[PDB]
Design an enzyme around this catalytic site. Sequence first.
Site, PDB file in Angstrom:
ATOM      1  N   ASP A 225       0.820  -1.204   0.000  1.00  0.00           N
ATOM      2  CA  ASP A 225       0.000   0.000   0.000  1.00  0.00           C
ATOM      3  C   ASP A 225       0.869   1.275   0.000  1.00  0.00           C
ATOM      4  OD1 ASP A 225      -2.342   1.652   0.487  1.00  0.00           O
ATOM      5  OD2 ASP A 225      -1.464   1.707   2.603  1.00  0.00           O
TER       6      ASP A 225
ATOM      7  N   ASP B 168      -0.405   5.121   1.016  1.00  0.00           N
ATOM      8  CA  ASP B 168      -0.767   6.116   2.028  1.00  0.00           C
ATOM      9  C   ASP B 168      -0.703   5.565   3.433  1.00  0.00           C
ATOM     10  OD1 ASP B 168      -1.524   8.460   0.366  1.00  0.00           O
ATOM     11  OD2 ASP B 168      -3.209   7.212  -0.206  1.00  0.00           O
TER      12      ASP B 168
HETATM   13 MG    MG Z   1      -2.775   3.160   3.467  1.00  0.00          MG
END
Ligand code: MG
Length: 291
Positions: free
Chosen positions: A43, A45
């Site tokens: 991922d 963010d």
């Molecule tokens: Mg994230």
Amino acid sequence: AVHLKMMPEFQKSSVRIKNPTRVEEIICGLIKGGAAKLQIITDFDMTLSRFSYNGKRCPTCHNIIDNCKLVTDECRRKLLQLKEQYYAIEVDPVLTVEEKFPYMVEWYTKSHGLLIEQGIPKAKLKEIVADSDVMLKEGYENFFGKLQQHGIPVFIFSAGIGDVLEEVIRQAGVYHSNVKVVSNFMDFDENGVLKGFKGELIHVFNKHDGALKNTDYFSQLKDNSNIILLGDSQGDLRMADGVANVEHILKIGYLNDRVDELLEKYMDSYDIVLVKEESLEVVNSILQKTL
Ligand SMILES: [Mg+2]
């Protein structure tokens, strides 16, 4: 043989591991396979980027546009309200993940739709990002540099804005050839102004979908049966659903927030949980043994 006890990085008080012997066994397989068998699925963010700096809350790719000079205070009032209504839904403990899907679609579609109204030019994204408060996690240069050094596949899988994400990593000098970015990409009109978003929407709960629709990528990497997965949400756990054959997978979760509520669920689902941790040193320490 691997001993988490002898790795000073794992002694940090932010490191929570339910099953240390199990984790040692996985890292042991990672090491055995070496470079040849490794790929990263990650991922963006709040995983590769920081959740907080100088007592300050850092922006997501979406927040970068929300906050920029190209967007009115009036648009930011709408965006705020959206977040208040829909984040209450996201974190609602009574609703099934499945029941939240349509709400998430609505939120991202409404908020992207306000951004489309503000009129975001492509050419301006460079400066927007340079002027932004974005921060990569401590150790990023090492993280990406060992990976590029050994040609390890990195699949950043993001419910963020892909144009923004890429500019961040490009300005950081870590957008190397080994890094593939799957995200919500902007769709530009004749004048290079934003008119919508490309493809199907990636949100926090449907990464299984995108993961399976990236066959294109994962079948080329048949031999990379060892995976490191990094996320900060429960939804990030599905990011490896498209992998051909899995021999060893290590799931490392950033628990940034809602710590008392989520710690048990995180310790049960991720192998390593990194509580309120703004560096990449635990993963770097595993890369160091492995690469
Ligand atoms: Mg994230």
